[PDB]
């Protein structure tokens, strides 16, 4: 019903994450759209790059 709700559901949908985690991303960006987008992509990249389990 407003841009903030949209951004939150977009993050939840695309990162497949909780409401609280998405809100953490939003808070971290502090209103800077580009910063939020960059953060989104950083985490998107990590999610699609890392193996579930790594043994050392």
């Amino acid at each position: 019903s407003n841009a903030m709700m949209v951004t939150k559901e977009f993050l939840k949908t695309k990162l497949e994450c909780s409401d609280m985690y998405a809100q953490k991303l939003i808070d971290e960006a502090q209103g800077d759209e580009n910063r939020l987008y960059d953060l989104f992509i950083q985490k998107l990249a990590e999610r699609h790059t890392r193996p579930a389990i790594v043994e050392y």
């Binding site: 994450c17 909780s18 609280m20 999610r47 890392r50 193996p51 389990i53 050392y56």
Partner: protein, 168 residues
Amino acid sequence: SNADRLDVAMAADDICTAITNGEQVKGLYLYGPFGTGKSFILGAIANQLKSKKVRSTIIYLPEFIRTLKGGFKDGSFEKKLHRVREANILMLDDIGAEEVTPWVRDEVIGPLLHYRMVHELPTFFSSNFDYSELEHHLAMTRDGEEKTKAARIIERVKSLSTPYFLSG
């Protein structure tokens, strides 16, 4: 945050030295804002231990949960999954970033954490959440049963770890 970093560095140094000397240790719960180097430090600990011929495992929780949720059969994941609960040193990287799935939380993670708690197996964590926030994240709903399950999880996490904040 230099101070944060110094504190965590001597925590990691002490923990690695103790582990290598065969002592009982408690893992770190590293938390704070995005990109402060929490996962990096868990990796540095794993590699430090590796340099001393000590084994450890790092689970990336979002993909762990995604794989469990989506289903799997017989590959590297299944083979590795069957070792994780009793790994000598285990790290749960980015708890809080996974999709919350009650059956995975309660049938896999909870029992895993209970096991490692009662057998005092070193368990590390990284998160963007502090313990209270994580406890809230772990509850899919306001429901009573969810609150209880989440509480069980978080108390086990607390028994297993010492919290360190890494600042922005």
